[PDB]
Amino acid sequence: GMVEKPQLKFKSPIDNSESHPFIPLLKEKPNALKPLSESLRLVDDDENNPSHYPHPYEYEIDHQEYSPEILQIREEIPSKSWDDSVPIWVDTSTELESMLEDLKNTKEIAVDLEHHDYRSYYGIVCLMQISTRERDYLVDTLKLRENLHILNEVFTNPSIVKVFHGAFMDIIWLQRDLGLYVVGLFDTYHASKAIGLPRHSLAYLLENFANFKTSKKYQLADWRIRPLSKPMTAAARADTHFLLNIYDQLRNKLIESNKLAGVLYESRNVAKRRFEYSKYRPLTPSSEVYSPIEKESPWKILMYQYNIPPEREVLVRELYQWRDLIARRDDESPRFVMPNQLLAALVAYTPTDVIGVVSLTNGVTEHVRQNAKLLANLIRDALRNIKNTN
Ligand SMILES: [Mn+2]
Ligand SMILES: [Mn+2]
Numbered sequence: 001g002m003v004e005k006p007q008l009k010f011k012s013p014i015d016n017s018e019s020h021p022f023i024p025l026l027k028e029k030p031n032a033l034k035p036l037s038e039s040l041r042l043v044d045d046d047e048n049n050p051s052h053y054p055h056p057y058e059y060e061i062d063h064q065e066y067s068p069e070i071l072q073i074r075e076e077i078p079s080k081s082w083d084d085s086v087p088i089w090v091d092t093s094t095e096l097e098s099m100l101e102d103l104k105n106t107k108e109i110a111v112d113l114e115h116h117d118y119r120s121y122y123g124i125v126c127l128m129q130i131s132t133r134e135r136d137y138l139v140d141t142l143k144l145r146e147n148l149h150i151l152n153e154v155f156t157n158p159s160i161v162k163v164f165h166g167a168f169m170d171i172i173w174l175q176r177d178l179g180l181y182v183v184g185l186f187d188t189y190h191a192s193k194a195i196g197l198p199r200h201s202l203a204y205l206l207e208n209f210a211n212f213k214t215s216k217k218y219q220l221a222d223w224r225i226r227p228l229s230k231p232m233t234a235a236a237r238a239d240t241h242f243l244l245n246i247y248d249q250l251r252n253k254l255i256e257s258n259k260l261a262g263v264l265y266e267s268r269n270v271a272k273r274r275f276e277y278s279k280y281r282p283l284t285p286s287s288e289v290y291s292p293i294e295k296e297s298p299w300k301i302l303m304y305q306y307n308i309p310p311e312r313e314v315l316v317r318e319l320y321q322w323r324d325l326i327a328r329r330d331d332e333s334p335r336f337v338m339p340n341q342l343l344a345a346l347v348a349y350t351p352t353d354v355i356g357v358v359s360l361t362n363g364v365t366e367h368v369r370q371n372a373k374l375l376a377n378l379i380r381d382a383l384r385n386i387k388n389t390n
Pocket of ligand 1: 112113165167
């Protein structure tokens with residue numbers, strides 16, 4: 001079909017202006033050790049790190065003690081039979097409340113998410129998967145975008161282990177879109193590395209410990225689509241359905257070889273990762289902070305040198321900045337507005353009228369088609385400025 005942009009239905013409108021450092025969406029702060037008061041303040045310009053808000057749960061992540069049953073080798077619990085249950089679809093505040101009540105009665109849960117970034121500037125969390133020893137949950141993070149914050153009661157309860165595989169970006173996505181934080185994380189990716197398994201991916205773990213073969217024929221899928229297709233519903237359920245059992249085996253092996261403390265340390269730091277706008281990103285790019293990383297051509301004159309002439313970097317740069325502004329304005333990804341190959345195509349052929357712009361041998365996007373005149377003017381200016389100057 002066409003898929004209507006889910007953003008249009010968000011309770012709170014999106015803001016890509018980036019006129020202030022990221023502000024935590026957190027209004028309440030359960031399992032608090034340090035009041036939310038001190039949390040929402042600021043950290044005035046340093047030199048390495050410009051002004052910004054700190055991670056609202058950083059303190060707890062450092063002080064909150066782990067569940068004593070995590071340091072103990074325990075009899076593992078096999079994953080429940082896939083066919084013995086259906087994944088529980090959650091898309092109403094009432095369904096959300098019941099799941100929540102259920103999660104509060106666990107010792108650990110497995111969590112994962114599905115994300116979308118083609119038709120959104122920063123990106124949007126489209127689905128959340130949660131598994132208990134007994135059931136698999138599929139949460140519509142689109143329809144419940146503003147309600148999900150209540151999961152912090154469990155996501156920040158240090159008495160409940162939250163298991164994720166390589167959650168470095170998921171931690172970022174969770175705060176940015178849902179204002180969710182995690183205290184009591186166990187990252188199976190770091191567990192796999194510490195133990196020294198040949199491969200460290202989720203698929204590798206699923207294949208060898210749960211005899212489940214994965215199909216990456218969905219990491220390019222569109223998670224905004226409602227209802228979810230059977231195959232996508234299954235592939236999402238598979239992210240958390242087998243994870244707690246894998247958690248048991250890796251944990252026991254870590255205790256058995258005295259490496260658990262290191263994995264918990266690595267995990268606390270994954271959970272401490274803070275999301276910030278590229279504009280207010282710290283100088284030295286560290287793993288402690290994340291800011292939007294262009295998924296396309298090198299800022300300005302690209303290295304994909306489509307034989308990019310000398311005096312055309314000004315043109316290149318204007319196209320880049322124009323693209324970014326339109327992307328931000330319409331809340332779209334830069335590639336949806338204009339992919340590097342098209343941008344490159346414009347710079348290479350330098351069309352100066354609408355006909356030239358829309359008939360580019362390569363092809364054209366809706367945005368380029370709708371701004372053909374502006375682009376033809378922009379390009380014409382670039383050429384005129386060249387013929388002059390020198
Ligand atoms: Mn994930
Ligand atoms: Mn997935």
